[PDB]
Amino acid sequence: LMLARQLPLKSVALILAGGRGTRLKDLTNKRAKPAVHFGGKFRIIDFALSNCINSGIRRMGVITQYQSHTLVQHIQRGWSFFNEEMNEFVDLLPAQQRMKGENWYRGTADAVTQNLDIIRRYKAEYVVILAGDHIYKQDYSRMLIDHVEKGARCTVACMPVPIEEASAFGVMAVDENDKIIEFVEKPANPPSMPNDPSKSLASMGIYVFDADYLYELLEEDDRDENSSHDFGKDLIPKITEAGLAYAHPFPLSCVQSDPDAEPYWRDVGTLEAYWKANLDLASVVPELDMYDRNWPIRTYNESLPPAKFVQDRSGSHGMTLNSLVSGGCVISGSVVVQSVLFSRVRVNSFCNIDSAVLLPEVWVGRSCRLRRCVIDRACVIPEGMVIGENAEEDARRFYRSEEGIVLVTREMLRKLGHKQER
Amino acid sequence: LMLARQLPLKSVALILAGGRGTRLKDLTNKRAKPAVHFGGKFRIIDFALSNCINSGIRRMGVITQYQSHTLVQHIQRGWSFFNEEMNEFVDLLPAQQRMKGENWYRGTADAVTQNLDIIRRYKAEYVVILAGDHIYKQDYSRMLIDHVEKGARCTVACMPVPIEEASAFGVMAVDENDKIIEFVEKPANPPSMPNDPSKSLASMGIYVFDADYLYELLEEDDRDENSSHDFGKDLIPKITEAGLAYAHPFPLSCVQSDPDAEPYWRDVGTLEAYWKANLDLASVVPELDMYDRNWPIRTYNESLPPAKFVQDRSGSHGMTLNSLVSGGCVISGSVVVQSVLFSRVRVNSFCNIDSAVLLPEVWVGRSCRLRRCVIDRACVIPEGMVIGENAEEDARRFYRSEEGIVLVTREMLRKLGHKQER
Amino acid sequence: LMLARQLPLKSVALILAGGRGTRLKDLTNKRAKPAVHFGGKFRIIDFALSNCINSGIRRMGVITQYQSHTLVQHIQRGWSFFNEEMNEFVDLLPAQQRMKGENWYRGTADAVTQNLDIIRRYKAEYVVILAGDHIYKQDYSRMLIDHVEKGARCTVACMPVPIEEASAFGVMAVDENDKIIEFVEKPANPPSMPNDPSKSLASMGIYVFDADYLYELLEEDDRDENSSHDFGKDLIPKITEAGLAYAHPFPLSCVQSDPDAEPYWRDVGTLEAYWKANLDLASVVPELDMYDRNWPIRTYNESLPPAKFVQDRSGSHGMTLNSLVSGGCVISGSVVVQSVLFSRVRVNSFCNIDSAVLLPEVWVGRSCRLRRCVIDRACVIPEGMVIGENAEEDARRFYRSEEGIVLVTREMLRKLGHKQER
Amino acid sequence: LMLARQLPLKSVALILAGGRGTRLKDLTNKRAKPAVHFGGKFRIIDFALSNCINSGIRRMGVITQYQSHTLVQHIQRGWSFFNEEMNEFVDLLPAQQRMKGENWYRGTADAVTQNLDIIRRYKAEYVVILAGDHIYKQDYSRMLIDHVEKGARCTVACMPVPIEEASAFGVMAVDENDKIIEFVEKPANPPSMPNDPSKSLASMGIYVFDADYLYELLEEDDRDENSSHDFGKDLIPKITEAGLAYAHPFPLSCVQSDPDAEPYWRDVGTLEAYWKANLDLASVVPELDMYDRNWPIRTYNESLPPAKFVQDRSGSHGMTLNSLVSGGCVISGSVVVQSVLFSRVRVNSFCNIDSAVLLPEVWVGRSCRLRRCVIDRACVIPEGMVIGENAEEDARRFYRSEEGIVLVTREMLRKLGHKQER
Ligand SMILES: O=P(O)(O)OC[C@H]1O[C@](O)(COP(=O)(O)O)[C@@H](O)[C@@H]1O
Ligand SMILES: O=P(O)(O)OC[C@H]1O[C@](O)(COP(=O)(O)O)[C@@H](O)[C@@H]1O
Numbered sequence A, B, C, D: 001l002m003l004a005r006q007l008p009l010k011s012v013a014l015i016l017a018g019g020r021g022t023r024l025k026d027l028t029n030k031r032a033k034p035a036v037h038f039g040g041k042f043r044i045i046d047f048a049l050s051n052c053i054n055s056g057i058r059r060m061g062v063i064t065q066y067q068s069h070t071l072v073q074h075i076q077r078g079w080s081f082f083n084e085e086m087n088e089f090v091d092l093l094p095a096q097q098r099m100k101g102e103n104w105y106r107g108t109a110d111a112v113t114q115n116l117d118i119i120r121r122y123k124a125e126y127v128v129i130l131a132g133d134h135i136y137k138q139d140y141s142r143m144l145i146d147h148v149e150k151g152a153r154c155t156v157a158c159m160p161v162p163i164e165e166a167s168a169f170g171v172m173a174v175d176e177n178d179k180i181i182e183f184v185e186k187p188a189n190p191p192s193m194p195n196d197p198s199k200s201l202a203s204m205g206i207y208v209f210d211a212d213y214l215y216e217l218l219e220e221d222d223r224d225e226n227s228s229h230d231f232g233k234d235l236i237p238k239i240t241e242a243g244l245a246y247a248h249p250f251p252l253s254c255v256q257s258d259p260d261a262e263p264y265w266r267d268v269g270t271l272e273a274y275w276k277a278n279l280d281l282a283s284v285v286p287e288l289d290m291y292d293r294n295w296p297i298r299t300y301n302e303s304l305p306p307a308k309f310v311q312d313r314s315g316s317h318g319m320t321l322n323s324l325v326s327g328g329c330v331i332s333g334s335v336v337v338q339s340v341l342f343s344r345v346r347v348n349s350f351c352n353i354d355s356a357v358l359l360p361e362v363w364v365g366r367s368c369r370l371r372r373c374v375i376d377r378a379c380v381i382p383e384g385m386v387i388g389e390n391a392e393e394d395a396r397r398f399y400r401s402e403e404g405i406v407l408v409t410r411e412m413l414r415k416l417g418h419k420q421e422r
């Protein structure tokens, strides 16, 4: 008794919010992938932070490494609501990751070593290593209980995924005790589970270390001159060889409004998945429940007026089907379908928006037809523009993925001669 | 030089947020009129507070007297964002107005006397007496500059209003210097201005006193056994007899996005004006600009998901014309017109909502037709209900004003047998 | 597993901060006993609030009933640091206890009934009834675990106390299962424990109810016309007759830095105990540990400069032995012993302060000798005053208890002709 | 009228908190000079921030460049108390100053260019360039009024200083209109004022630019390949050649409790001045008034218990003369003189501390004699250590300045074999 309440209390979260999101390819070019707008008013890292609140871990480490100003500002404004006198705080740890090191060189692990003295000053018994550019719902206290029950030194959150995409994350092979037998990091030919050939038991980048080991284990890897200083390439394979690595099935701890559904864990890294995962919310029955009161997700909530709908220049009405319209939006006529409008979006008359993601402060000119697109923050689409109808034009002007999703950025439009400053 | 910056610094605001709003007649029965929801996510007193922020008066006194729990909670959550170490705070002063005293007996003024020692502890040179159940935009620093320039002891904000409603507020007659010649409080036959017969120069319940006089002036009225201890009936007529009362034309200080319009000051006290003033925002060109960045109005902003629009049970779309939909709302089909939806309103399919004000957390059942109505907070309208089409039915069930506006409350619906707890 | 973490989450604290502290007899005459300054920078209710934080109960109800302005202001400034979007808040519930009712008439319980609808809106499974004018350290989660393990409907925190003072609190007789056999409220002849004749097993005013019962149980007592609507006189005796009342030995849950000591629970209600409990902190080995990092006690922490020590008018030094000097204090010479100085105390030269409690903003004139006294907040002791040396003089001027403790208030000194406004 | 209130509103502060403080030589080796502890509980940058609050400039830019984690954390905890919805915020701008650039290469100015787009997003009419590693009290609104009255494009705060140290700051020669005639940056032979030979009219690193010029002026210097991108070397000399530079005598705007004193502006950069400026506060009549209520200086105020004084191991008392003891300190006996104790300092028995600055969390062992020293944060001085009595020993072990001041750091003591981790 009195373990699940005294386990978060002794533990500290370390959100590795340094992802470059290179597969968004322009969207995160300007801001860290943890700061990517998602689903109304939220930011991706909020998820990884909210799970730490609702799981009782009120001591978090936000390790900002690349292009991190908006993440710093966002944390400062929204999550600067803790009294540090009662051991509950979001320590924003600038990583200052070595410039000598290239993109993902002096990797994930080298950023948690540079700030090791400050982590030691926390005197935690346990530590929660997290990837803070993912979307999921999880109670980390259930994972800490499952970590202490097994008497392990590292606990990896493992989930079965399709074997056609399992090369993107580390793949493990476990025994009856969920103890790791074999870890392999980004394999070209992922091994399947024994019971399921079409699936692979992949890691989720959610580790739980006992602190005194983690420290003892980082320095050995820090002195190493051959390692990539990466949690998947170097540390977890070593712990697997030692035999002190255990697995945690994510279905045990995922926070689901409805128990019947398949666990929800979206690795947003590619544009087409960002678009899909933003449009899941606009559907008739979303897979991710934002209206869950048992498990609320918090963000920086600014004072916006209600979403205003008005008549077009001709005086007619506007139609909306399966759409999200956040605060500050203004709409005039303009049939909307399957789309998601972030804050302060102005859509003038005669517009047809279908399956679009409009990031904050967009200005859509009159008579615009937008389809299967992602409009970056603070764009100004000119009058008469047409996107998504002719594929070759959209590839020629904007970034069009192989699937058909289009990404419209200020830069692209500036280059087209449509002046943006407004 | 350096007067307008050093004038708010020496002054403290006193918001008289004890209004009963008796002319709403059920709406404020449960909460103080300053806590009445207005226009999306705001509360009326926020206006009187925001004007104090944007006018530099960061020391406010919120004198809560009647049925004041939601106002206390609202202040505690939203406006508890000040560091008192730098002389900037919202002192929530429980008035504890004498029970012996009846409704508006031991009036406006007796509530600012009971807490006089604490007001003296502020050591202010000036004090701003405000009515905190009104809607307006005003820069009080311009009023303090105009107060010091004239060398007065009390400065009353005066505005011309129609003489057919001027009996509701105190009426003054001023000279060329804006110095008060004759004050009269709630006259049955309001005297007209000399230049305009159809108008009367009425007070707005916005006074500015030099503190050392105000104190000296309250005690004399406090020792008095004949007075009503009311700022309009007792104090300001006395100052008018002394000749130390001056007037401030509200057009000089009103904060207007567009200078061409007539000043905006709504005395919400009656239901029909609450409805109109809430529906002005949904119109094509509102008279009150909420999107003004120079003069933002702040409220308690809670984290709500975006306004979700979905398909009805039949799969068809939903139409919105000249409407406001705040955060957390959910709509399925349901043609909406000229209405305003507060937070967390759920409107099921086949509904026709026209010129309605739906306060937070309403649940409208399927196939509801609502017209020219005001639905009180946390109602649950049953399936098939029809309001606003047949006047006699709406008078028989709910409160129907003489104009045609309908007010739907939990109590009324509970009495009809429609069980509300959900 | 996962009970102690999911038990506070479903529970809400109700701090009954309406105590009049009549046995302080002037100290709480001006402010609610929960707002009584204690031990440096803290307020008594902070203890009852901090225990709710460190025990995970982040939903608190502060039921303010009498003379409650400083408590409201204190909560608003200090404990208004919660985001209510994640179910964690201090709901300041004005009780508005019936005036018809006299001092402790329509008692403890009638104040938790008037606000019952709002408590129901919390949808808690459990509720923690607390006395918020006491000093103690306790982990309420251990008490909730012990409450669920026994399968009870009310859990009372019981502690053995001396039988010479056991008439002050309710006395219970329990079985081997800690199930209540016999409850009796403020008996003139308290029954002793069977094993110890010199002690009585008394209640601590810390109850834990399962919510759905509590509601069901308040209304029955609310409809009652014969009850005192008191938790000790009416409700807990009834639950004892039903047989659904269980006891919780406070030694199991008390948070002690050193396990060897006897539990620390001070019922401050009398002046002499307020003085002793404030001087325990100044001793060489305090019984209550404020430097405990595992269990921090939070208060409204204002920005004060360090405690300044300077030379007297003659240039000599100042001596301090077993003393506490909080922020903002200023001392010149002035031998100090066994005393406790609250914020912004100025002690001029040639003063001898021995075993004194100086509340905030005191001004001690030159050549003052103070001994075994309690100086109320914002006093101004004149030059040459002598307290504590001649008992009859101190009884004649100030309030001198039977033990010898002296209480100096502004009123008393105003009456002596020593003008205080400074 | 209504200029001094509408001038801060249109202006934004830019605190250049990237100083390396190389002349402290170990003290700032670990933390940015703006984060250097000063005078009880404050940090140097707090001054530059507090002046912006009390001068109405509630929009600040904290440009963190070097070794900036504690400054980020300090801002996040203390100064994250603003609602950004009402245009009032501390935007923490990571500078990410070019590594290619050496210490003070791509200087002061290049750090305000890299973040130019975000500064433009503020749409300020004026901008306040500040050095955030200095100590002073100033009302910037008086400076903005004096800036608009003269019709200038840059306003430099100028003060006469002694000509024996005037080579450390830029030296100007002005006309009767306070218009700059000749600027020269760090001259080896500073020119004296015409009326005073012993003084030079030096700059204070406090500039006020009209924004649209500043932008226009940075890019020209940014395109330049020959400049040092320094505000003193490059920009202000260019503006002086244009003739659009004006001077602001700092005595007009300094905030002084007593008008008779000489303005207080301490350039802390050297250790001996840090020690003196920290010991000015402990004196009998400090030159800098921290008890000023008109102009409060705010810091991150954590909940600390009062400064505890107790008896030594032998039971004797402790003497304090002209000393500051902040919260959390603990003292046993231990004669103290002319010193300043930061938070959580523990001084065991038999210690003689004279004219010392003990930074937070120091642990002084028994029988220590400390004189004319500066003990760095979180040291642990062993038993019997003697500092300041024999100069050669202190030079051999610790850093001893030419004047006699000693600086004790963890590193130094670690190297001596006194293990520090506690
Ligand atoms: O080319 P620009 O003008 O920087 O525009 C790129 C856009 O990226 C942004 O930096 C994105 O902002 P955030 O990612 O910080 O929310 C916008 O501020 C900006 O308009
Ligand atoms: O009859 P009930 O159940 O009190 O309902 C009346 C309604 O008035 C309210 O008190 C209004 O709330 P606020 O005015 O505090 O926003 C609701 O909480 C409540 O549902």
Ligand SMILES: O=P(O)(O)OC[C@H]1O[C@](O)(COP(=O)(O)O)[C@@H](O)[C@@H]1O
Binding pocket: B117, C030, C031, C035, C070, C377, C378, C410, C411
């Ligand atoms: O007789 P007075 O002037 O009210 O003085 C009584 C004292 O009691 C106090 O109200 C006590 O204050 P708190 O109890 O609110 O801390 C002081 O403000 C006041 O000086």
Ligand SMILES: O=P(O)(O)OC[C@H]1O[C@](O)(COP(=O)(O)O)[C@@H](O)[C@@H]1O
Binding pocket: A117, D030, D031, D035, D070, D377, D378, D410, D411
């Ligand atoms: O050699 P170490 O262990 O880093 O110690 C150096 C000291 O400098 C510090 O970083 C100074 O802290 P701050 O400057 O952040 O207040 C201490 O945390 C630390 O103890």
